[PDB]
Structures are given as structure tokens and as C-alpha cells.
Ligand binder design. Structure first.
Ligand SMILES: O=C1COc2ccc(-c3cnc4ccccn34)nc2N1C1CCNCC1
Ligand SMILES: O=C1COc2ccc(-c3cnc4ccccn34)nc2N1C1CCNCC1
Lengths: 319, 319
């Protein structure tokens, strides 16, 4: 079972109309995760949502966001070749091991906040931030995943409205209000921080009505083991009024976020320019069969084709 | 979800009338694999074979056979708490990485042969030996799994008949012939050796009729990279006449099995007496709440209950 330069292996997840398989790249031997989308069963509205997701993945390039390597498209199927995160979901990690100590939660949350603030720099809101969409690579680095519900947000625009996971949804979402975008992601990050440090959700209910009532009241329990600094940080995320909710760039200066990083304060990610001139990698690809000129054309136009994927995968360590 | 002293985690497999879930032992924190069988779906004949499998697992104690730690039984469900092998099936390993070099195949095959010869010492035939039932632990040690089709073999009797995986089945099984027991495992181990060294099955076909004819002819292709010693060893397993097939105790002396193993010739496993007197582990269990006397009674009578499982799990490394 091959597709392009990829040997398909075991299934990682199954949705309706899509599945995710682990795969090996034939030319480099690197492992990847491939989202396989059956286009035949999609209406034109779902199809445009699909191409929107691809456009967002091409915009985002951050070490803690799942990276897109290659797009293969047939009449029936779309293949999105992406990073593989071998240690799975933060959600499953919390279920198995319980709460993280604050030192470990801080390491993950600095990466999470950096990635999401970087999305907002790029005028993208994720809109479904939850523990299940935080992946972990082999070194336990965060990789934010599933931008299938994400969208651009615009000055003077309000978002078409949608509800991700209700436990992570801001109170304005329960009230059907229009919203700009980023403030809703900020609230979800407050819920995420609470789950990292406690192993549980701050707002829960036996049904949606009860959950909604608790979110709108905005009260949550502080466990005895939680530090005052962590409690104070949570107050900057879980503000009912979106106008007064902290922004991520402000929250990056928080004392808890930077404990043990006092000379390395968290700051907005600065995207480096992509090095497309590594002749060591180009020489390897010329040995494979691609011409020097083909490689420079694919890389300079950033085609997300078989050549740029090979070049990027050669820049990643083996497994 | 919990069952007894175990927190159930992700599903590892789902078959007909059973599933396998990874789990954590609450008292010790050790990971395990739990086979979960809905007894309500079984007829009395299936129920009989289920308790047969349990009896067989209690007989076998070998470092390269999946170990049974505990049995939990409710009116509706049977839980078999077993060793977890974190690196999965040899079958998937061959699919992903291709053939093993003969030195890597030799290390696995010595363990496989030791485990199966030990089964035959205990008058147990596995009857479904195949790449899918060879698991790999965190250190790539073999763990033979799934004794659901295994049986005792006896002097004077012939086996009830059953079909394992056709590609691994001995020729006499295709001809409906009665058989003693261990000779069919020996044939399957020849097929396994071939698949380890070549990455492919020796006998295949587009359908069962074609596969059957090739197995009965007993001819298979020797790749140019295979050593003469490996070719000669295969001839001792893949003998059409079960009467003339080598026994595993004889095959253990083969040059290929022992190449580079000076002062370490492969020989029948000698099962040591289980140390049930480790006062360091017992003291931990007394701290947990069990009484010293209860622990001695469960271990001395080897009950495979919550006490013996805890004692065994405390003797395993954290992972
Ligand atoms: O829905 C998608 C679509 O975008 C993805 C891109 C890459 C991966 C992925 C990479 N490495 C692994 C390892 C295990 C599971 C998924 N992946 N997954 C998704 N998913 C998962 C599915 C489950 N919840 C989290 C998101
Ligand atoms: O059929 C059974 C029943 O006996 C078992 C006992 C232990 C485990 C097991 C232990 N560790 C792992 C890791 C991954 C998958 C299974 N396991 N499995 C089975 N199975 C597998 C399922 C797939 N085919 C090979 C046998």
C-alpha cells in the first residue's frame, strides 16, 4: 500500500470521511503521519472547508505545531503528509499518569502559548484547542494538531460562529454571541492549563445545561496543591468578560510562566527564514535522481510537493 | 474504567468475542495487557476452550512467553491480566523494516525456539505460531502470545483438529490428517525462520487452493543472500513427512543457531523455582494492606489473584 513516496503502515485514527496512518518515506526512511481524506463523500461546502484547512497548514510553521510536508491529491482522495508525534495525545497522557507537576506543566504550556500566540500573529484562530489536540513527540515536545475547524480572523470582522468541545468553550460561545476569535482561544488555554496541573476539567456537568451554567458563572475549584502563582495565572485566562481577558502577548510575561526561565522570558515566536540552500541535502537528493534545477524550483516556490518534502525530511533526525 | 486493581487504557486489539487493552496496575504502577472476554457471547463449547487457555497459561513460565499475572472473573466477563510487550508484533516489524540480517534473526529465533521447546517439554502444542503471535518487549525480546488455540498433547492420542493460519500450517493439516502435536509447531517454526531472514512467506498463493498445493509440494525459494547454514537449518524444519521432521531439542544443536555462541550452546530451558519469599516485596505489600499470612497463602498456592499479581509486578522494572 504505497502513495507517492510513502509506504502506508498502521492506522493512528479514524474519523468520518478521513483517517490518519503512520507511514515511512521511501527515499529518506523518515516516519510521517498521513491524513487521508475521501473527497467523494464531501459536498462542495465540506470540500472548501478542506482546502481552507490546507491553506492554513501552509501558513503555519512553528516547532510546536504539527508541520505539513507534502500534499498528494487524486480525483477521489486528498493526502496530507504531516509530522508524526510518537507519544500521542496530552489527553491520554493525563488519563494514564494523572496531573503534571507544575515544572512539567510549565514546560508544555510555554510551548502551547508560543504556538497559539504565533497563530494569532498570523491571523489564525484554532477554535478547537483541547487536550486531545495537543500531541507529544518522542521528546515530549508539544505539537498542536487538527486545524480542521480553524479560520482566519479579520479586523472589523466577527466569526461565523461554531462550538468546539463544550468543556473548553468560552462563555460567550454558550450565549451565541459574535466574537473576534483570539479571546476564545485564550479561554480554551485557561482550561488547558487547569487540566495540565490538576488532571481534570475546571467546568463539568452531567449534561450540557449543567456544564453551560457552570461555565457562565465562571467559578472553579483551586486544589490545595496548586501554587498561588498558578492560581493567579489562571485568573488571566478564565475571565468572563472577553474584553478584560488577558492577551497571550501580555500573559507571556506572567511570573508562573517564567519561573526558572528568569533570563529567558517567553516572548512571541520569530519565524526564521527557511534555509533552502543546504547543499549537503541537495547533493543527497541529486544522488536520488532529482535535478539541481528541479530542487531549487520546488523549494523557492514552496510547492509542498515530493521534492520539498524530501528536503525537509532530510533535515529531521532518523528513527 | 477500572477492573479490580487495574485502570483500563487504550485498546491494543479487537477480535471476535474478545479485546485486548493496555492498563496500569494501580497498586504498583506497572503496565499490563488485559484480554477481555465477554462470556455471554460464547456457547458452552467456547466457554470450555476459554478455561483451557487459562489452564495452559498457568502451566507456562518462560521469559519469552507472555506471562499471566491475574485472572478476574465476573458473571459476564473474563479478564486475563498479562505481560505487555511495548514493541508490538514481529509481523508489523517485518512489514515496516523488511528482512532481518541473519545475526538479528538468530537472536530472536534462539528465544523463539527456547520458548516453543519449553512448551513441548510441558506437553503443550501452540498450534498457531505465526509472525503475528510473536511480540517484542521494550528491549526487542521475543514474547510468544495467544495460546487460545493451544492444547495438551498426550501419548496415544491424536489432536482434535483445527486450522491455524494457512501460510504457517504443516502439510498434514491441509490433508485433514490426524497429528500428534509438536511436529506441527516445528513446521510453523520453519516458516517463521524463513520470514525472519527473507521478510516474506515461503508458501503463498492467490487463494487457498493455490497456497495448499505449494505447501504440499514443500518447495520454496532460497534467496541469494541466505547463507548455506541457514538453508540447511530450514531443511530440518520444513520436512514434508512429520515422522522425519527434526525435534526442537535436536535442532537446538545446529551450527546456524549457535554461530558465535561459544560456551552458550542453545539448550532446553530449565524452569527455576519461583522465589515467593522476597521479603522486600512482601513488606511493600504489607504496607499496601495485605497481611503477611494472606500473601504467603496466595503465593504458595499460586492463585493468580490480586496478591500474586502484585508480587510478580513488583518484581518487574517500571516502564
Ligand atoms: O484529527 C487529526 C488530523 O490532524 C492530525 C495530524 C497529525 C496527527 C498525528 C501525528 N502523530 C500522531 C500520533 C497519533 C495520532 C495522531 N497523530 N493527527 C492528526 N489528527 C489527530 C487525531 C486524534 N486527536 C488529535 C488529532
Ligand atoms: O490475541 C491476543 C491474546 O493474547 C495476548 C496476550 C498479550 C498481548 C499483548 C501484550 N502486549 C501487547 C502489545 C500489543 C498487542 C498485543 N499485546 N496480546 C495478546 N493478543 C495479541 C493480539 C494481536 N495479535 C497477537 C496476539
Amino acid at each position: 500500500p504505497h502513495i507517492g513516496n510513502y509506504r502506508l503502515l498502521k492506522t493512528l485514527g479514524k474519523g468520518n470521511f478521513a483517517k490518519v496512518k503512520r507511514a515511512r518515506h521511501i527515499l529518506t526512511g523518515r516516519e510521517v503521519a498521513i491524513k487521508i481524506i475521501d473527497k467523494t463523500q464531501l459536498n462542495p461546502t465540506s470540500l472548501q472547508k478542506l482546502f481552507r484547512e490546507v491553506r492554513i497548514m501552509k501558513i503555519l510553521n512553528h516547532p510546536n505545531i504539527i508541520k505539513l510536508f507534502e500534499v498528494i491529491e487524486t480525483e477521489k482522495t486528498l493526502y496530507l503528509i504531516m509530522e508524526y508525534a510518537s507519544k500521542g495525545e496530552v489527553y491520554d497522557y493525563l488519563v494514564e499518569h494523572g496531573r503534571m507537576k507544575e515544572k512539567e506543566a510549565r514546560s508544555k504550556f510555554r510551548q502551547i502559548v508560543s504556538a497559539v500566540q504565533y497563530c494569532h500573529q498570523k491571523r489564525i484562530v484554532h477554535r478547537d484547542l483541547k487536550a486531545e489536540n495537543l500531541l507529544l513527540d518522542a521528546d515530549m515536545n508539544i505539537k498542536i494538531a487538527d486545524f480542521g475547524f480553524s479560520n482566519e480572523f479579520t479586523k472589523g470582522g466577527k466569526l461565523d460562529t461554531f462550538c468546539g468541545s463544550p468543556p473548553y468553550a468560552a462563555p460567550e460561545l454558550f450565549q451565541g454571541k459574535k466574537y473576534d476569535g483570539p479571546e476564545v482561544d485564550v479561554w480554551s488555554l485557561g482550561v488547558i492549563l487547569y487540566t495540565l496541573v490538576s488532571g481534570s476539567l475546571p467546568f463539568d456537568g452531567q449534561n450540557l445545561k449543567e456544564l453551560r451554567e457552570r461555565v457562565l458563572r465562571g467559578k472553579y475549584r483551586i486544589p490545595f496543591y496548586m501554587s498561588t502563582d498558578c492560581e493567579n495565572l489562571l485568573k488571566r485566562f478564565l475571565v468572563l468578560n472577553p474584553i478584560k481577558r488577558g492577551t497571550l502577548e501580555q500573559i507571556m510575561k506572567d511570573r508562573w510562566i517564567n519561573a526558572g526561565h528568569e533570563e529567558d522570558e517567553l516572548k512571541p515566536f520569530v519565524e526564521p527564514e527557511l534555509d533552502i540552500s543546504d547543499q549537503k541535502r541537495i547533493d543527497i537528493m541529486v544522488g536520488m535522481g532529482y535535478s539541481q534545477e528541479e530542487i531549487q524550483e520546488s523549494l523557492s516556490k514552496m510547492k509542498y510537493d515530493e521534492i520539498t518534502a524530501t528536503y525537509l525530511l532530510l533535515g529531521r533526525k532518523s528513527s
